[PDB]
């Protein structure tokens, strides 16, 4: 039914309403911020990063350089010199305090909704000159864009942006400088971000001034029927609708603003064997330098191998309530173990991986050329490629946790399946009574949400649009 | 020079070409030809491995326009695309058609809702139709864009054909168990509800028509002044009330509710798909699975189905997905005794 | 208290309620299993 | 209990029937 229709005619009363929706969004960040802090795990960043807890907000606070907590807990791990005077802890109080102020005010333009005060205007009480509002609000927004990119991001004021290298974890927040050419025009060089806002900030400044001064020719009032709000609504709905589909891909594909240790990996890195690759080059490189296979693996940093476990690719999960990754694998604590499956003649067998598309895969072992050697038969009767008939063997030359060798066919087999998931790990299943089923990362969640919403705002754009331009038709 | 065009252009002829008339026709024409052209003349086995057209002899059903190769991701390979290099023939060999059809065709849908807005401000009618039309457009983007985006590439998007669509269906049943999704369920609700309405409304009318309105007693007449129209709400009401038990009798509601059911449905269904785009599904019942593994004398239809799926997946994925190159040894395949 | 920009009358009828509840319960029914499991 | 809840929401959908079909607002021609 219709009820919020009543606010269409009154500005001061509608600025109250708009105040509360804004007051709740500030009080939500508190709930969220606070909730996350009480839940988050500090113990180990390398194998149990925020994207594994299922922490949502945390990521964006980090993104712009908030790393401390009044209690010492920092994501970089280095706390010997951490005194962020206003960190997560304090950021929480910020939004809640803000939520509070905005709230109270709302009440006093809702009770005091007249235009008879200590003000200087351009407006007649029963009107709002839109094209002027725009220019005014615009210029002051464009000014922001400017600062955020110029001072904030460049280190002029310290909250540099967060940076990361291609693979690993060597990323800490450092000032970011923009390179205006093309190299930094794509979405990966943070220079594209910084440069942007600076440029767009300036254009906003200008565009503002020139939207404040010239007035609507005849398109605004005659064509886009802009005497009433309605249009400002449809106009903007399609803008956000557009942004929601941009962020959504930004998130899912990955951009300079969608780093790794903040939201986890991508499906594109799994289908791309992007990790397996770097990992390999770290072995043929070191191996050729006079080390033993055992030695090389034991060399490649583990976080790198973690990024390789499939459970870290947004896999499955329409409905899996708490859906933190951990009630899936469990809490990971393990090694960068490479399982080498050799045969009875010593040939090195290669296992086929499971495509993020399947919920279950058939354990199969291939030769280095693509030949089929071992498999785990379903119909054991006329089996020919069994594991026992051909005798396989698993030998672990990996991170500390497991530098040995195995024979039994029951044991050997187990790993084959756990191999199919890429790297092999051990999880503290019992702490959360994990069920052992996969779950999804904040990326999938952030996407599924924001894409649907956006899709959902398309109706919103078209409803309010037509309803704007057919006043008389609406009435019939 | 402007307004003139407005009018010349918006001139009320046989086929109304409005301002939107420029998007609609160039796009809705090429999107049709694009189909019909490849359907009749192109092969897509360089990209998919199967037979695409009539040129190779498929029946109407079999023939279709197949999706690009998975090796290409989401590169819109237009004729001047760095990949096709301007060579038409190959631009077709590679499937550069799909993209053609979906893009032009996406705008034809844009034009058609626009043309639905025009006509409402010239005639002075309500825009509602233009809004009911969003459902299909949702379904469309949901399907052919959002979904392929979320996944490995263009390949996995429905294929432009008949059978090529049935294969889509099945695909979904195996890897997603889309039937268990609640969203597809509601979608399934409106579509069947749309047809249930269409029958009762159309039959009630026709059958409650005013007696003797035609001496000859056939029913091919009306007029403008025929304000009252040919039938009774009072009798329908009682008819239903005493047969079904309920009957909101207020013509204006009856018709609107007829907008709500179908359309409300497809929006869900489309939502449901934005979900699968991210392999986020409703393919499991933890509760059951758990007791399903700790105990072997317990089975429900929930389970029996999950079995068929794996069968779909094992047998259908090596021929259906040429790029990974699946090699599956006879024994390995799941298989019920004797079959 | 003394402002007239608002049309202050909110109404839902008997019938609208029936359909309202019929939707929430049915809707609830369906989803029930999903929240639960 | 997973049960009673599927039953509970059931008894209501039948209670709503009775009440909708036998206690509805009249469709009158007094107009």
């Amino acid at each position: 039914y219709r009820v919020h229709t009543v606010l269409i005619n009154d500005p001061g009363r509608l600025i109250a309403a708009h105040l509360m929706h804004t007051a709740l969004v500030a009080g939500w960040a508190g709930s969220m911020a606070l909730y996350e802090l009480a839940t988050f795990d500090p113990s180990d960043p390398v194998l149990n990063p925020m994207w594994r807890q299922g922490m949502f907000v945390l990521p964006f606070m980090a993104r712009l350089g908030v790393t401390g907590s009044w209690s010492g807990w920092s994501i970089t791990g280095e706390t010997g010199i951490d005194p962020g005077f206003w960190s997560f802890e304090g950021v929480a109080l910020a939004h809640i305090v803000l939520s509070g102020l905005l709230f109270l005010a709302a009440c006093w333009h809702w009770v005091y909704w007249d235009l008879e005060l200590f003000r200087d205007p351009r407006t007649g009480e029963p009107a709002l000159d839109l094209p002027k509002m725009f220019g005014i609000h615009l210029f002051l927004a464009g000014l922001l864009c400017f600062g955020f990119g110029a001072f904030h991001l460049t280190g002029l004021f310290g909250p540099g942006m967060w940076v990361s290298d291609p693979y690993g974890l060597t990323g800490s927040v450092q000032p970011v400088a923009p390179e205006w050419g093309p190299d930094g025009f794509n979405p990966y060089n943070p220079g594209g971000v910084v440069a942007h806002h600076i440029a767009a900030g300036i254009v906003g400044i200008i565009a503002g001034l020139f939207h404040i001064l010239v007035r609507p020719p005849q398109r605004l009032y005659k064509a886009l029927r802009m005497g009433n709000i309605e249009t400002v609504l449809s106009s903007s709905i399609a803008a956000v609708f557009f942004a929601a589909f941009v962020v959504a891909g930004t998130m899912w594909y990955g951009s300079a603003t969608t780093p790794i240790e903040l939201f986890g990996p991508t499906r594109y890195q799994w289908d791309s064997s992007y990790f397996q690759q770097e990992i390999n080059r770290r072995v043929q490189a070191s191996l050729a330098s006079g080390a033993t296979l055992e030695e090389a693996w034991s060399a490649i940093p583990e976080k790198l191998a973690f990024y390789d476990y499939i459970g870290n690719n947004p896999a499955k999960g329409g409905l899996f309530r708490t859906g933190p990754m951990n009630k899936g694998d469990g809490i990971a604590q393990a090694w960068k173990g490479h399982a080498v499956f050799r045969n009875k003649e010593g040939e090195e067998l290669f296992v086929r991986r499971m495509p993020a598309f399947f919920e279950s895969f058939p354990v199969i072992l291939t030769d280095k050329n693509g030949v089929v050697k071992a498999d785990i038969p379903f119909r054991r009767a006329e089996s020919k490629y069994s594991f026992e008939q051909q005798g396989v063997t698993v030998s672990f030359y990996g991170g500390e946790l497991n530098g040995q060798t195995f024979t039994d066919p029951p044991t050997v087999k187990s790993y084959a399946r756990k191999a199919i998931f890429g790297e092999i790990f051990e999880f503290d299943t019992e702490t959360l009574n994990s069920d052992g089923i996969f779950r999804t990362s904040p990326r999938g969640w952030f996407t599924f949400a924001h894409a649907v919403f956006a899709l959902l705002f398309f109706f919103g754009h078209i409803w309010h649009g037509a309803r704007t331009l057919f006043r008389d038709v609406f009435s019939g | 020079w402007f307004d003139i065009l407005d009018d010349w252009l918006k001139r009320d002829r046989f086929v109304f070409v409005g301002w939107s008339g420029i998007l609609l026709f160039p796009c809705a024409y090429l999107a049709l030809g694009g189909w019909l052209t490849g359907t009749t003349f192109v092969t897509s086995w360089y990209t998919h491995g199967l037979a695409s057209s009539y040129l190779e002899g498929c029946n109407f059903l079999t023939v279709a326009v197949s999706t690009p190769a998975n090796s290409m991701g989401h590169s819109l390979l237009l004729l001047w695309g760095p990949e096709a290099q301007g060579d038409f023939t190959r631009w077709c060999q590679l499937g550069g058609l799909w993209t053609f059809i979906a893009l032009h065709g996406a705008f034809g849908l844009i034009g058609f809702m626009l043309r639905q807005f025009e006509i409402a401000r010239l005639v002075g009618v309500r825009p509602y139709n233009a809004i009911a039309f969003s459902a299909p457009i949702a379904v469309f983007v949901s399907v052919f864009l959002i979904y392929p985006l979320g996944q490995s590439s263009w390949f996995f998007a429905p294929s432009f054909g008949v059978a090529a669509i049935f294969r889509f269906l099945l695909f979904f049943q195996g890897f997603h168990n889309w039937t268990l999704n609640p969203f597809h369920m509601m979608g399934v609700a409106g579509v069947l509800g749309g047809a249930l309405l269409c029958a009762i409304h159309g039959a009630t009318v026709e059958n409650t028509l005013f007696q003797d309105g035609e001496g000859a007693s056939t029913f091919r007449a009306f007029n403008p002044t025929q304000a009252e129209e040919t039938y009774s709400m009072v009798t329908a009401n009682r008819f239903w009330s005493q047969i079904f038990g309920i009957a909101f009798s207020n013509k204006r509601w009856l018709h609107f509710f007829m907008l709500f059911v179908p359309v409300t449905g497809l929006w869900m269904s489309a939502i449901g798909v934005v979900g699968l785009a991210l392999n986020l599904r409703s393919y499991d019942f933890i509760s059951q699975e758990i007791r399903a593994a700790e105990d072997p004398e317990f089975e429900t239809f929930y389970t029996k189905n999950l079995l068929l799926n794996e069968g779909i997946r094992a047998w259908m994925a090596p021929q259906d997905q040429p790029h990974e190159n699946f090699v599956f040894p006879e024994e390995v395949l799941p298989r019920g005794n004797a079959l | 208290m003394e402002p007239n920009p608002n049309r202050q009358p909110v109404e839902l009828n008997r019938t609208s309620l029936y359909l309202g509840l019929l939707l929430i319960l049915v809707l609830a029914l369906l989803f029930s299993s999903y929240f639960f499991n | 209990m997973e049960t009673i809840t599927y039953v509970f929401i059931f008894a209501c959908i039948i209670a709503l029937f009775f009440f909708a079909i036998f206690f509805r607002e009249p469709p009158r021609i007094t107009k």
Binding site: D435 | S287 | L21, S32 | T5
Partner: peptide, 30 residues
């Protein structure tokens, strides 16, 4: 069996809020 007990609270509130809601409005109506 094993079910997430939060479902109950979820599924109960789904039943009540929108319902309560409408219950308030059908009284103001009369």
């Amino acid at each position: 069996m094993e079910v997430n007990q939060l479902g109950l609270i979820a599924t109960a509130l789904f039943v009540l809020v929108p319902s309560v809601f409408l219950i308030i409005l059908y009284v103001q109506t009369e």
